[PDB]
Amino acid sequence: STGSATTTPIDSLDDAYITPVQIGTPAQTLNLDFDTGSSDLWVFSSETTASEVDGQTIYTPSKSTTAKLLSGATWSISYGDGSSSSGDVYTDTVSVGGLTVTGQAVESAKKVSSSFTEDSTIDGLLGLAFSTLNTVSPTQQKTFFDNAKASLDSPVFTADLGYHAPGTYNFGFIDTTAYTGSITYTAVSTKQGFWEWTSTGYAVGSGTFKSTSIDGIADTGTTLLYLPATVVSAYWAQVSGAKSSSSVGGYVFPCSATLPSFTFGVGSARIVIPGDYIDFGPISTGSSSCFGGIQSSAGIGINIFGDVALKAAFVVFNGATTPTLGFASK
């Protein structure tokens, strides 16, 4: 089997991407944030505290003939940005882009933090990291990908995120028309439950490539590119007037600037992030200070290849017995 679904930016900055997902019978379509940095499929629901729902589409398990309470199961998750959600669990039929899983754990939110309430465009998350990170207790649950894997033509999914444009998540096949050149594969460590890999270095603009190992995670659920302070300082040093602002919460730059590209290494291959991808616009409406798309990971504890980086590539998440990650230009 295979699946193919379009993913669409939620706003003009590509702050996140939403992908339609069919849950239950008859289908209830919710727009979920596919997140390769977590492993819970959770939804706004008929159980979500009413004051914490503001425009989202909800899953109502009582309207699904295939929903069943997973008795005694609860879940609670905290994300790197300080957001959180929690609740109980149903099993139901879930389909993505024509690919159907029966008995998928659908985590129904009873509570969500303010960041989720305030984002009317995101109806929940679909985790695509390793199932060892799933938060369901007392019986940990499998991700959609893990449940689908054995039925897939090939045990893979791919992320092809757009810059200010829709893109695609495919399951079970590699679309050889969606990228240019060849795919370079690189080793993954699953020890922390993430798609964790080691980049071979970086360049700033037209500068020379610096060969250096950068361990980090491929995380579709994180907007920006978070790298070591040394690397980030080297990048922003090439933008006149750029500075790290503790009041804003990271590097800012004059909105009048032309940003240089940023290149990262995948083995002997190179992925170029155009400068425009690194512009996140005015810090507040009308400001001439703009927010940077490359930020320091210092104090996160991990480097994060978020959307800024991933959208410059066609990315293969290979879930074979020995997992790997593939990157191609596009």
Resolution (A): 1.2
| Residue in 330, 326, 260 with CA at minimum distance from that of residue 293 | 260
Beta carbons of 329 and 179 less than 8 angstroms apart? yes
SS3 265: strand
CA atoms within 13 A on the CB side of 285: 0
Residue keyed to tokens 């480097």: 303
- In the residue annotation, 284 being an active-site residue is answered as no
Which residues fall within 8 angstroms of residue 121, CB to CB, at 6 or more apart?
10, 11, 18, 31, 55
Please answer whether residues 34 and 19 qualify as being in contact, where contact means their C-beta atoms are separated by less than 8 angstroms.
yes
* Longest Cα–Cα distance in the chain: 60
Q: Do domains 5-174 and 175-330 have the same CATH topology?
A: yes
Domain residues of the chain, as ranges?
5-174, 175-330
Distance of alpha carbon 150 from the chain centroid:
23
Closest CA to 294 of 308, 310, 276: 308
Residue 60's alpha-carbon distances to 26, 102, 126, 168, 294, in angstroms, are: 11, 17, 17, 27, 39
The catalytic residue among 14, 33, 35, 279 is 35
First-residue to last-residue Cα distance in the chain: 25
Instruction: Extract the tokens encoding 73.
Output: 């199961």
Give SS3 for 309.
helix
Which of 272, 288, 97 shows the shortest CA–CA distance to 181? 272
Q: Which residues contact 274 (CB under 8 A, 6 or more apart)?
A: 163, 261, 312
Cβ distance 105 to 87 under 8 Å?
no
- Please state which CATH number belongs to domain 5-174: 2.40.70.10
Task: Identify the active-site residue in 45, 86, 108, 199.
Answer: 199
Q: Which two tokens stand for residue 308?
A: 């800024």
Cross-sheet strand order for the sheet of 196-204? 269-273, 262-266, 196-204, 210-218, 303-305, 225-227, 294-296
Q: What CATH number is given for 175-330 in this structure?
A: 2.40.70.10
Q: Using the 8-state DSSP alphabet, how is residue 206 labeled? A: T
Residues whose CB is less than 8 angstroms from the CB of residue 169 and which lie 6 or more positions away in sequence, other chains included: 3, 4, 5, 7, 19, 34, 96, 97, 157, 158, 159, 160
Contact criterion met (CB below 8 Å) for 38 and 77: yes
Q: Are 275 and 261 in contact (CB under 8 A)?
A: yes
Contact yes or no for 193/129 (Cβ under 8 A): yes
Helices (H), the chain: 114-118, 144-148, 229-236, 307-310
d(CA 298, CA 133): 23
Clarify whether 199 is annotated catalytic.
yes
